[PDB]
Design a protein around this motif. Structure first.
Motif, short mmCIF file in Angstrom:
data_model
loop_
_atom_site.label_atom_id
_atom_site.label_comp_id
_atom_site.label_asym_id
_atom_site.label_seq_id
_atom_site.Cartn_x
_atom_site.Cartn_y
_atom_site.Cartn_z
N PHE A 88 0.83 -1.21 0.00
CA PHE A 88 0.00 0.00 0.00
C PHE A 88 0.86 1.27 0.00
O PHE A 88 0.55 2.24 -0.71
CB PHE A 88 -0.94 -0.02 1.21
CG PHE A 88 -2.09 0.98 1.14
CD1 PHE A 88 -3.37 0.56 0.83
CD2 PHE A 88 -1.90 2.32 1.46
CE1 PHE A 88 -4.43 1.46 0.80
CE2 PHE A 88 -2.96 3.21 1.43
CZ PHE A 88 -4.22 2.78 1.10
N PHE A 89 1.95 1.28 0.78
CA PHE A 89 2.80 2.47 0.84
C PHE A 89 3.53 2.70 -0.47
O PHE A 89 3.73 3.85 -0.87
CB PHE A 89 3.83 2.40 1.98
CG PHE A 89 3.31 2.79 3.37
CD1 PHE A 89 4.07 3.61 4.20
CD2 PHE A 89 2.10 2.31 3.85
CE1 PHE A 89 3.62 3.96 5.48
CE2 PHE A 89 1.65 2.65 5.13
CZ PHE A 89 2.41 3.48 5.93
N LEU A 90 4.01 1.64 -1.14
CA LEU A 90 4.57 1.87 -2.48
C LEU A 90 3.48 2.40 -3.41
O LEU A 90 3.77 3.23 -4.28
CB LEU A 90 5.24 0.62 -3.06
CG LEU A 90 6.49 0.04 -2.36
CD1 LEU A 90 6.93 -1.27 -3.04
CD2 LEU A 90 7.67 1.04 -2.28
N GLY A 91 2.22 2.04 -3.16
CA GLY A 91 1.13 2.58 -3.97
C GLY A 91 0.93 4.07 -3.76
O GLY A 91 0.49 4.77 -4.68
N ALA A 92 1.21 4.55 -2.56
CA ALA A 92 1.06 5.97 -2.22
C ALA A 92 2.29 6.81 -2.57
O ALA A 92 2.16 7.91 -3.13
CB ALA A 92 0.76 6.09 -0.73
#
Ligand code: CLA
Ligand code: CLA
Ligand code: CLA
Ligand code: CLA
Ligand code: CLA
Ligand code: CLA
Ligand SMILES: C=Cc1c(C)c2cc3nc(c4c5[nH]c(cc6nc(cc1[nH]2)C(C)=C6CC)c(C)c5C(=O)[C@@H]4C(=O)OC)[C@@H](CCC(=O)OC/C=C(\C)CCC[C@@H](C)CCC[C@H](C)CCCC(C)C)[C@@H]3C
Ligand SMILES: CC1=C(/C=C/C(C)=C/C=C/C(C)=C/C=C/C=C(C)/C=C/C=C(C)/C=C/C2=C(C)CCCC2(C)C)C(C)(C)CCC1
Ligand SMILES: CC1=C(/C=C/C(C)=C/C=C/C(C)=C/C=C/C=C(C)/C=C/C=C(C)/C=C/C2=C(C)CCCC2(C)C)C(C)(C)CCC1
Ligand SMILES: CC1=C(/C=C/C(C)=C/C=C/C(C)=C/C=C/C=C(C)/C=C/C=C(C)/C=C/C2=C(C)CCCC2(C)C)C(C)(C)CCC1
Ligand SMILES: CC1=C(/C=C/C(C)=C/C=C/C(C)=C/C=C/C=C(C)/C=C/C=C(C)/C=C/C2=C(C)CCCC2(C)C)C(C)(C)CCC1
Ligand SMILES: [Cl-]
Ligand SMILES: [Fe+3]
Ligand SMILES: [Mn+2]
Lengths: 26, 28, 37, 60, 77, 335, 28, 432, 38, 341
Positions: I25-29
């Motif tokens: 999720f954080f790589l997505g953000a």
């Protein structure tokens, strides 16, 4: 004072001469 | 009196060096 | 600046110096394909 | 001029196709005779293209 | 099971090849529609100051901290 | 009786003496004796040293009202530059001492001696039939010695910018260096710091693990030597806990499950770290600096939003304006 | 004009000249 | 071969090429392709972002300056009057790349594996000393001829950019090499301390071309010597004749000349003119002082005889030799010499009358320009120290070249130590 | 030893699954942050 | 057997990762500590506690992000999410620097769980737990700086923040206001840590070059990995080497390996004592005698007196934005400058 200059040349060439005539005698 | 203290304690350290090298225990 | 008839290739010349670096990468995928001697 | 453009593009497309033809021909030992033959012909074209495109640069 | 054949099983493919993009795209949308600026209270990229005054916000109380910073947020400070 | 040249050549190359004296040692001993003796006399009683060429000297001697934490041997004056400056280059002794010649004498003699020390380590290892490359580990402190005493002065163009030989001298050098080259934000010093914290960590860990494992060691010992079997007992069991947590990752990072690589990794980590930071100070002598982040963030009304790096740049100004007395109008400087 | 097509194809030319040796038997 | 039988990995795979002759030479020429490839391609790239109405060092080029120094595409005053010659050298380097690369590929997939079975002339082996002293002797002759290409270019074909001709430099033909050994070989007898710097103090093209005559002539001599000699007994007794010891000796020499190249590009302003590469370090401080001196006397009056607030003069003071020099921090330089500074020097050092009324507009603009372009920089690529605000991207080529070659020389020192240790292990093995 | 049975809920299963979903999720953000226009 | 016994032997199975009683304190606390740092250095602002930006969403790179400290008015507050400052609002809680404390406290109990984990692991295999004792040097450092030091200051605002540039700032801050290089306890810390790195390099090299089995093939068939080494080299060749190079050597392997443990640890402990002393702003700042001698004769000048001027500078030019809650305004005629002396 340039006798000291003369003296320093003499006494240090003397030591590097020991080092390298010993390093060729091995 | 302060400079004396500095050089005296240093004099003691080098004497310690001398004895710890030439007068160490035999390895038994 | 580049010649005035050579200006079509003006963006082309700008990735030339990078080419050697990519050889190191090429030389690795060749080892990946062979499954690592 | 006009011929300079078409030949300068010709050099780019030719150099492109030769650069992927050479190692593939060399890797593989099947039917290497005819392979060496068209490498010879393409290298010949290429070292012709280079000096003709060179001199027509000066009539720009 | 061991991690030496753990991404070679048909299980890995069938599930993750759909759940990975789903939650990745969820992580994109979180920032792309600006929800993060409202959840953690991050100020928008041109709301660091009000137009009323050009001073920086600093809360000088701890039990009225809440309505002080709400007052700063009111004027877009 | 054995022709004094061979008595001399036997006595030197002897591996039977208390302390080895080598062919390198024949150069190490007078250079180190000069450097040490000149340093003791100078740290006690060197006359104040004009170091900026403005005729305002900086004291550095215990007898002139310093203690040892505020003492230093003060570098040569700003008029010397890179010039060789022996005794016979001065027309009297008191102007030699005023110009800070003793520092130069010391640092040249020490650098010579250090290289000879490295050389002598290689020589005894060769003689005893050992493996070489303990000296390769020793080239890490020699490299930093070179960087801070020789290379950084040549780049700045004067031996008045070298590190003073003292406690407060060393800290003054650190402060005025950070001010102008911003080294915390330079990566090569960062690899250095990583090496030193990592070296301490791996030192502690190795000591603790081995010193619980060993039960007792023994060797028979005779009246001048050591015995025939160096015997030791060590415990040889362990739990899957440590194997799955720590063991799996040291073996993966060595890319070998041999534990031969453990001590190897042990030697390599501080040395390499310290090599890179030695590169840092060298390249910074040629005025290539670390990062600076200024106005990384601005809003869309054109007003700068400060970062945690801007506080640091403010302190850099603070230290730097105090470190120029030269003019008010210093515009673009160094070098 | 086509001056992204060139920079595209030259960067994707890498794996292609490996892949052709896989079929014609230069090396697996 | 193509499976493990040497005890090497795929990441040590280059070690299998020692007993392969054809493949070894093939690696060498295929790599040589990439080298000339970067040459031709980086210069084309760098010219596509080179505006010929602005000084070169302000935009940061590292290859076109060398080309400019050789009399191709420059005029008198360091201004670029045409850019076509640069284009030419770009494209020609790039096309020679293809032919080097084609030979490399051929000799690594189709060319033989051993050269010693077609002719032993193209063959070699690492213990057969006579072949390798002959191969070395061949290469010295053609490098000597290559060295003489520079004095050919100097003497006949348009000459070089002498920066010490009047008018702030001029490209001229050179007519006089210095053939006196007492002048040439005196440099190797100079101190490596300040005031000299040992080879790094050459201040005229005449010594440079005379030296290149000498280099060419001893290199041809030595090549002819090694073809017609097999090494003598003391020679053989001293060295390894193993395979990788030669690579070791080579690494070891490259290390030193990297340190020498560093000193050269950071101090010398004669054979790297300072108007294609940026200004030199000592040059910037001296310019900063002198331009203020000239500037303040036009408004106020002469204060180079005036005393200052420090205890010493406002702009001029005495060195320990009785020579009148600039004052300030910049007293640390006084062995500096620049083209724009020599006509204002008299016998007693700087003569104050000459600052008063011998100034030319070109000297003043050169100094005033250089003050604000002092060598400084950062890895995030803005100029100035870590206090200034971004309005400048400038960092000087001199810093880039020096720091690169310094780190590569260090890395090559350890590479020398590695390979020398391994040559010694191999020798200590096989002596039994 | 440690033979395999080990259904869906195990210790190593929850270990990879409480470090997996927030990192991706954080790589997505962090990815969508690159294409902010400020 | 009762349920307790069944729980206990479930926890101590041989498995890839060891859970244990200690695991229950370590793993949630560690996860939440670490994860709070991450979620905060990516999203959470500090425009309201310092007037800075410090997260990726705002613009920043890897070295300039941080989770930053609270404002000065918050006192030594716990900064509970249910406390009377947030009042159950996750936004205000992020805005008030409330999660710096979350990270700090959860990481402190994570430390405690790790040292217990080292004890009961070492208890299981039945070896002496020196490594658990070594690990109380890092705990000493952590609690003396990140917890005790600002509890001697007036607020947590003067605590260091979790981040690269924030702690680079801490270095320059301490240099300016405490002159921390001139404190004997930090000097003893420097000696200890550098000596650790010294022993590390020397031991690795010495051992790697006194290897057994340099000739014929390995006559060593185990490791036996938990032994580390020490079997693979000859004590006598190394001891004989260093008696001639340096003139003293170890002749006892156990005492060498104990020295390597003692040095960095006593090192960290001493610097901890010093910084808990700085927590009540008792500072070895100046030698009284040097100040008197400089007052009476103003041509006296020392490398030390220069350091004092430089630190005066650090304080004066860094203060207004490092303490923007004080509202320092310095007209430029009051700041210190070299050209004004
Ligand atoms: C926060 C902690 C921290 C840490 C861990 C470090 C760590 C380091 N810093 Mg520092 N530094 C810090 C903060 C820190 N720094 C800050 C905040 C500043 C800003 C003010 C600096 C500014 C700074 C500078 C300016 C320099 C360093 C350098 C160094 C390192 C160089 C390698 C080394 O140890 O050489 C140690 C170097 C030596 C020369 C020691 C070897 C000495 C020899 C060979 C002596 C042998 C003979 C002996 C005297 C005789 C013994 C006799 C006896 C036994 C009887 C090391 C990596 C230095 C560096 O890179 O040096 C190259 C350097 O120049 N740092
Ligand atoms: C550059 C490449 C090159 C290489 C690889 C060789 C290789 C070799 N040459 Mg050779 N040579 C070269 C160029 C080269 N040569 C040139 C250009 C000449 C023409 C002048 C010669 C002429 C020459 C002769 C005539 C002979 C050799 C010989 C030798 C070999 C035997 C060992 C020997 O004589 O040791 C000699 C000793 C040394 C190399 C060590 C001392 C080197 C010097 C000059 C150091 C001076 C340093 C200086 C003081 C530093 C100042 C520093 C400053 C900052 C203060 C060795 C195989 C002999 C041989 O058998 O060849 C087949 C032989 O008969 N050389
Ligand atoms: C540019 C740097 C460089 C160069 C010049 C070489 C050169 C060489 N390496 Mg090598 N190597 C390098 C980097 C380099 N390496 C790196 C970084 C690694 C680590 C991954 C290795 C790993 C490595 C291994 C594992 C091996 C070698 C071997 C070999 C050589 C032996 C001949 C052979 O078996 O060919 C075999 C070659 C092939 C079967 C196919 C080669 C395909 C080619 C050359 C295509 C290139 C096309 C080009 C992109 C486009 C056309 C350009 C043209 C028109 C000019 C060859 C001489 C081999 C060896 O020792 O063999 C005995 C072996 O097995 N090397
Ligand atoms: C410039 C001349 C030169 C030449 C011709 C050689 C030739 C050779 N070396 Mg090298 N070497 C050099 C310089 C040179 N070396 C330098 C300067 C260093 C020091 C940094 C080394 C360090 C070195 C090691 C440590 C070893 C060799 C070995 C070898 C030989 C055998 C196999 C091998 O390792 O392949 C070469 C290996 C590769 C091509 C693989 C490269 C893979 C990686 C990932 C490394 C680099 C990544 C790097 C950090 C990326 C950024 C670079 C940056 C500057 C931009 C080989 C033919 C080996 C040897 O002697 O075996 C007996 C061995 O173990 N070399
Ligand atoms: C080894 C020698 C060498 C040297 C001295 C230089 C020097 C230079 N190159 Mg360069 N280059 C080299 C090798 C070298 N290059 C090679 C081998 C390649 C192929 C990969 C290139 C590819 C190349 C490109 C693509 C470009 C340059 C450009 C430039 C410069 C132009 C002025 C400028 O814009 O400054 C400012 C310099 C820059 C913006 C370049 C990057 C600078 C640094 C130091 C970034 C490092 C980032 C790194 C990730 C983190 C820190 C360092 C790390 C090692 C720890 C600078 C003078 C630039 C240019 O405009 O040329 C006209 C540019 O865009 N060069
Ligand atoms: C820089 C170093 C270099 C060296 C030393 C060599 C050496 C060699 N190459 Mg070459 N080559 C190189 C670069 C190099 N090449 C480059 C850059 C290219 C691209 C153009 C090639 C293209 C190439 C081709 C096209 C051929 C070779 C062949 C050969 C040889 C193979 C042995 C044989 O059967 O010869 C037998 C044949 C000959 C000796 C005739 C060669 C005619 C050529 C190409 C060159 C003429 C050179 C010179 C002016 C005259 C030398 C006279 C002699 C008495 C010494 C020889 C070992 C030849 C070969 O047969 O390979 C198997 C062949 O046909 N190479
Ligand atoms: C900055 C320097 C430094 C770091 C980073 C560090 C790191 C570490 N030391 C450990 C161990 C040790 N350290 C030791 C001695 C030393 N450690 C030292 C210096 C350091 N030690 C020194 C100088 C010594 C020598 C005396 C020993 C003897 C051990 C061990 O045996 C042990 C180990 O296992 O090593 C392999 C590891 C414990 C792992 C673990 O389970 O933690 C559990 C910790 C938890 C759950 C919480 C930690 C605190 C948190 C959450 C807050 C801090 C801030 C965050 C990390 C956010 C990022 C911060 C930015 C600044 C990047 C870890 C890799
Ligand atoms: C002729 C010509 C040309 C050409 C060029 C060429 C020749 C090209 C090629 C190129 C190449 C030569 C390419 C290749 C590439 C490669 C790639 C791109 C790769 C990458 C890599 C990869 C990605 C991988 C990696 C990895 C892995 C897989 C694993 C891990 C590790 C690593 C990370 C390494 C041009 C255009 C100039 C134009 C003019 C003419
Ligand atoms: C062996 C080997 C290898 C390598 C190889 C190599 C390295 C090769 C080479 C390569 C190269 C080295 C390439 C390149 C070449 C070149 C080219 C390809 C070029 C071309 C050019 C052209 C064609 C031109 C054109 C033009 C002109 C003429 C004018 C105008 C402009 C233009 C541009 C248009 C590897 C590692 C992989 C693997 C292993 C083995
Ligand atoms: C004059 C001149 C010139 C020329 C230059 C030259 C040509 C140079 C050279 C230089 C050089 C040529 C230098 C030297 C180098 C070398 C060295 C410095 C080294 C040697 C070696 C040795 C001494 C050895 C060592 C050792 C020993 C003793 C023992 C064992 C180990 C070893 C082997 C390491 C010119 C044109 C610029 C112009 C101006 C002037
Ligand atoms: C605080 C809080 C909490 C908790 C939370 C958590 C626990 C979180 C987590 C979080 C997390 C846990 C996150 C993670 C993150 C991650 C990241 C940030 C990543 C990064 C990345 C990386 C690591 C990678 C990189 C790379 C590499 C390494 C190589 C190359 C490629 C790349 C570049 C991609 C709660 C609920 C109680 C509520 C209250 C508050
Ligand atoms: Cl200062
Ligand atoms: Fe050990
Ligand atoms: Mn300076």
């Amino acid at each position: 004072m340039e006798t000291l200059k003369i003296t320093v040349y003499i006494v240090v060439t003397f030591f590097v001469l020991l080092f390298v005539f010993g390093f060729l005698s091995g | 009196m302060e400079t004396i203290t500095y050089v005296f304690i240093f004099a003691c350290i080098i004497a310690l060096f001398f004895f710890a090298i030439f007068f160490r225990e035999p390895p038994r | 600046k580049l010649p005035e008839a050579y200006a079509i290739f003006d963006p082309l010349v700008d990735v030339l110096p990078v080419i050697p670096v990519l050889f190191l990468a090429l030389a690795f995928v060749w080892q990946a394909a062979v499954g690592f001697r | 001029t006009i011929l300079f453009q078409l030949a300068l593009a010709a050099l780019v497309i030719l150099s492109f196709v030769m650069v992927i033809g050479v190692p593939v021909a060399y890797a593989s030992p099947q039917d290497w005779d005819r392979s060496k033959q068209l490498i010879f012909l393409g290298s010949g074209l290429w070292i012709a293209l280079v000096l003709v495109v060179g001199v027509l640069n000066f009539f720009v | 099971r061991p991690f030496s054949d753990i991404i070679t099983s048909v299980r890995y493919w069938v599930i993750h090849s759909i759940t990975i993009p789903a939650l990745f795209i969820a992580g994109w949308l979180f920032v792309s529609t600006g929800l993060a600026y409202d959840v953690f209270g991050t100020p928008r990229p041109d709301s660091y100051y009000a137009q009323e005054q050009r001073s920086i916000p600093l809360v000088t109380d701890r039990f009225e901290a809440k309505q002080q910073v709400e007052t700063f947020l009111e004027q877009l400070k | 009786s054995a022709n004094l040249w061979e008595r001399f050549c036997n006595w030197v190359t002897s591996t039977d003496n208390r302390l080895y004296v080598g062919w390198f040692g024949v150069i190490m001993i007078p250079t180190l004796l000069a450097a040490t003796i000149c340093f003791v006399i100078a740290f006690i009683a060197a006359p104040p040293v004009d170091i900026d060429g403005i005729r305002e000297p900086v004291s550095g001697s215990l007898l002139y009202g310093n203690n040892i934490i505020t003492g230093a041997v003060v570098p040569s004056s700003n008029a010397i530059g890179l010039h060789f400056y022996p005794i016979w280059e001065a027309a009297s002794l008191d102007e030699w001492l005023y110009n800070g010649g003793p520092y130069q004498l010391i640092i040249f003699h020490f650098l010579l001696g250090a290289s000879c020390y490295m050389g002598r380590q290689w020589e005894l290892s060769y003689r005893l039939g050992m493996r070489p490359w303990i000296c390769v580990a020793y080239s890490a402190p020699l490299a930093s010695a070179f960087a801070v005493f020789l290379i950084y002065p040549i780049g700045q163009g004067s031996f008045s910018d070298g590190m003073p030989l003292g406690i407060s001298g060393t800290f003054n050098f650190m402060i005025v260096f950070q001010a102008e080259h911003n080294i915390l934000m330079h990566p090569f010093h960062q690899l250095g710091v990583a090496g030193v914290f990592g070296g301490a960590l791996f030192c502690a860990m190795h000591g603790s693990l081995v010193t619980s494992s060993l039960i007792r060691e023994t060797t028979e010992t005779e009246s001048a030597n050591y015995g025939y079997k160096f015997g030791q007992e060590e415990e040889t069991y362990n739990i899957v806990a440590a194997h799955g947590y720590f063991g799996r990752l040291i073996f993966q990072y060595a890319s070998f499950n041999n534990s031969r690589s453990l001590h190897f990794f042990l030697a390599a980590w501080p040395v390499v770290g310290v090599w890179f930071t030695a590169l840092g100070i060298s390249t910074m002598a040629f005025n290539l600096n670390g990062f600076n982040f200024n106005h990384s963030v601005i809003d869309a009304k054109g007003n700068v939003i400060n970062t945690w790096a801007d506080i640091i740049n403010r302190a850099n100004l603070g230290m730097e304006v105090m470190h120029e007395r030269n003019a008010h109008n210093f515009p673009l400087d160094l070098a | 004009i086509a001056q992204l097509t060139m920079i595209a194809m030259i960067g994707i030319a890498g794996p292609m000249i490996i892949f052709l040796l896989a079929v014609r038997r230069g090396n697996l | 071969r193509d499976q493990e039988s040497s005890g090497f990995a795929w990441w040590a795979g280059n070690a299998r090429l020692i007993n392969l002759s054809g493949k070894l030479l093939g690696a060498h020429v295929a790599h040589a392709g990439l080298i000339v490839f970067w040459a031709g391609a980086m210069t084309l790239f760098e010219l596509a972002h080179f505006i010929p109405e602005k000084p070169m060092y302000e935009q940061g080029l590292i290859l076109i300056p060398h080309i400019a120094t050789l009399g191709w595409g420059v005029g008198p005053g360091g201004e670029v009057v045409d850019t076509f010659p640069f284009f030419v050298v770009g494209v020609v380097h790039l096309i020679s790349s293809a032919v080097l690369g084609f030979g490399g590929v051929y000799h690594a997939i189709r060319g033989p594996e051993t050269l010693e079975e077609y002719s032993s002339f193209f063959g070699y082996d690492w213990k057969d000393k006579n072949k390798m002293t002959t191969i070395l002797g061949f290469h010295l002759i053609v490098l000597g001829i290559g060295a003489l290409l520079l004095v050919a270019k100097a003497m006949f074909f348009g000459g070089l950019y002498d920066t010490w001709a009047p008018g702030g430099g001029d490209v001229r033909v050179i007519t006089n090499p210095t053939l006196d050994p007492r002048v040439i070989f005196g440099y190797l007898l100079k101190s490596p301390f300040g005031g000299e710097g040992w080879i790094v103090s050459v201040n005229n093209l005449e010594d440079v071309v005379g030296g290149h005559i000498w280099i060419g002539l001893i290199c041809i001599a030595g090549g002819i010597w090694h073809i017609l000699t097999t090494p003598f007994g003391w020679a053989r007794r001293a060295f390894i004749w193993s395979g990788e010891a030669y690579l070791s000796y080579s690494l070891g020499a490259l290390s030193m000349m990297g340190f020498i190249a560093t000193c050269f590009v950071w101090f010398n302003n004669t054979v790297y003119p300072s108007e294609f590469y940026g200004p030199t370090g000592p040059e910037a401080s001296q310019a900063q002082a002198m331009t203020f001196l000239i500037r303040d006397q036009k408004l106020g009056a002469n204060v180079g005889s005036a005393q200052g607030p420090t205890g010493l003069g406002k702009y001029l003071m005495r060195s320990p030799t009785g020579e009148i020099i600039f004052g300030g921090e910049t007293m640390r330089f006084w062995d500096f010499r620049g083209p724009w500074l020599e006509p204002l020097r008299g016998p007693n050092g700087l003569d104050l009358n000459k600052i008063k009324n011998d100034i030319q507009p070109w000297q003043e603009r050169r100094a005033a320009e250089y003050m604000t372009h002092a060598p400084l920089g950062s890895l995030n690529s803005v100029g100035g120290v870590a206090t200034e605000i971004n309005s400048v991207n400038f960092v000087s080529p001199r810093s880039w070249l020096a720091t690169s070659h310094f780190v590569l020389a260090f890395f090559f020192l350890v590479g020398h130590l590695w390979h020398a240790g391994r040559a010694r292990a191999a020798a200590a093995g096989f002596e039994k | 030893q440690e033979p395999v049975s080990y259904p869906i809920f195990t210790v190593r299963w929850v270990a990879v699954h409480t470090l997996a979903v927030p990192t991706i999720f954080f790589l997505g953000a962090i990815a969508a942050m690159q294409f902010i226009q400020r | 057997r009762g349920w307790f016994d069944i729980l206990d032997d479930w926890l101590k199975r041989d498995r890839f990762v060891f859970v244990g009683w200690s695991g229950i304190l370590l793993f949630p606390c560690a996860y939440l500590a670490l994860g709070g740092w991450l979620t905060g250095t990516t999203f959470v602002t500090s425009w309201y506690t310092h007037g800075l930006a410090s997260s990726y969403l705002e613009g920043c790179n890897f070295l300039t992000v941080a989770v930053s400290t609270p404002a000065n008015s918050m006192g030594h507050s716990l900064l509970l999410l249910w406390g009377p400052e947030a009042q159950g609002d996750f936004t205000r809680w992020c805005q008030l620097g409330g999660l710096w404390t979350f990270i700090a406290l959860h990481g402190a109990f994570g430390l405690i769980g790790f040292m217990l984990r080292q004890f009961e692991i070492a208890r299981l295999v039945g070896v002496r737990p020196y490594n658990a004792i070594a690990f109380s040097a890092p705990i000493a450092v952590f609690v003396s700086v990140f917890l005790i030091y600002p509890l001697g200051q007036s607020s947590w605002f003067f605590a260091p923040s979790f981040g690269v540039a924030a702690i680079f700032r801490f270095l320059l801050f301490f240099q300016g206001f405490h002159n921390w290089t001139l404190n004997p306890f930090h000097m003893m810390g420097v000696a200890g840590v550098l000596g650790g790195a010294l022993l590390c390099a020397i031991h690795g090299a010495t051992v790697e070059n006194t290897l057994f089995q340099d000739g014929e093939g390995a006559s060593t068939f185990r490791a036996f990995n938990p032994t580390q080494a020490e079997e693979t080299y000859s004590m006598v060749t190394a001891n004989r080497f260093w008696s001639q190079i340096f003139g003293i050597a170890f002749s006892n392997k156990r005492w060498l390996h104990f020295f390597m443990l003692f040095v960095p640890v006593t090192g960290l402990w001493m610097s901890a004592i010093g910084v808990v002393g700085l927590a009540l702003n008792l500072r070895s700042y100046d030698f009284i005698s040097q100040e008197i001698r400089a007052a009476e004769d103003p041509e006296f000048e020392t490398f030390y007196t220069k350091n004092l001027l430089l630190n005066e500078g650090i304080r004066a030019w860094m203060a207004p934005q490092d303490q923007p809650h004080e509202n320092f305004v310095f007209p430029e005629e009051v700041l210190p400058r070299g050209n004004a002396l």
